[PDB]
Every structure is written in C-alpha cells, then in structure tokens.
Amino acid sequence: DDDQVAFSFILDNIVTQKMMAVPDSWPFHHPVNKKFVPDYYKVIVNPMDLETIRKNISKHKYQSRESFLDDVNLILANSVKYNGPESQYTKTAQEIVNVCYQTLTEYDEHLTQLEKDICTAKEAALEEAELESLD
Numbered sequence: 001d002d003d004q005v006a007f008s009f010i011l012d013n014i015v016t017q018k019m020m021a022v023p024d025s026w027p028f029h030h031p032v033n034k035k036f037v038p039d040y041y042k043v044i045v046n047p048m049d050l051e052t053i054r055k056n057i058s059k060h061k062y063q064s065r066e067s068f069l070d071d072v073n074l075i076l077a078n079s080v081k082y083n084g085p086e087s088q089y090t091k092t093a094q095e096i097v098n099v100c101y102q103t104l105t106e107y108d109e110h111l112t113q114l115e116k117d118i119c120t121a122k123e124a125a126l127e128e129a130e131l132e133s134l135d
C-alpha cells in the first residue's frame, strides 16, 4: 500500500541530502528569475530545477527512475546549452547528475522492486475501473 510514498521518499532524500549538497549547486536549486538572468528563457525552452523536481516528487509524478532521471538530465542539457559544455555551471550540473546516479545505485534492488509493484498495482486498478464502468 505505501509503495509510491516509499519510492518518492527515496527520490526526495536524494535531491535534498545529496544533489542540493553539491558544493556551489545554488544556481540549480530554484527556477531562474528573469530579473536575475534576463536572457534565460530566450534560450532555454524547457526549463528545470531541483525545486521543480521536488514538487514533482511530492505529487508522485515519477513512477520510475527513468522518468525522474529525464528531468535530472534536462538540468545538465540545459546548462550545456545556456553556459557551454566547459562552463563551471555545467561542471557543477554534471556533479549533481553523478551524485544522483551514485546515490540511486545504493537503492537499486529496492527501487527495482518498487517500480514493479507500483506498475502491478496501477495495471490492477485500471482493469478494475474498466470492469466497474462496463457494469
């Protein structure tokens, strides 16, 4: 019964205790304010930041590590575009990504089981809803 809450607990703690704790990671903590970076949204069409990922986790957006990791990757790809691949901002984004992968590997077996159990439950609840409607 608590599989989504347990899955989201793991990912949120990766974000707050690992990824946010990367030194000098503040540029990625919150969405960019165009009063501080005026051309940002002229260049980045698909913005992402760690606060937005935490809100997504709190609403149980992610049911797999792949979908979480798509947003984490978007932070790195956006830094490569906006700042260049050799900018210090990109080097800090790349550390955020690597600490996320290394921390996730600490929970590999447990997250593999949670993703299967969350899928099994969603499939069962879908079939129930379909049968209740036809009847």
Ligand SMILES: C=CCCn1cc(-c2cccc(C(=O)N(C)C)c2)c2cc[nH]c2c1=O
Binding pocket: 026, 027, 028, 029, 030, 031, 032, 033, 034, 036, 037, 048, 049, 050, 079, 082, 083, 089
């Ligand atoms: C979430 C990803 C954006 C990462 N990021 C951030 C900034 C930056 C600098 C100063 C203030 C702020 C800001 O708006 N706040 C709310 C702290 C943001 C920046 C400046 C040049 N390149 C970048 C860059 O890529």
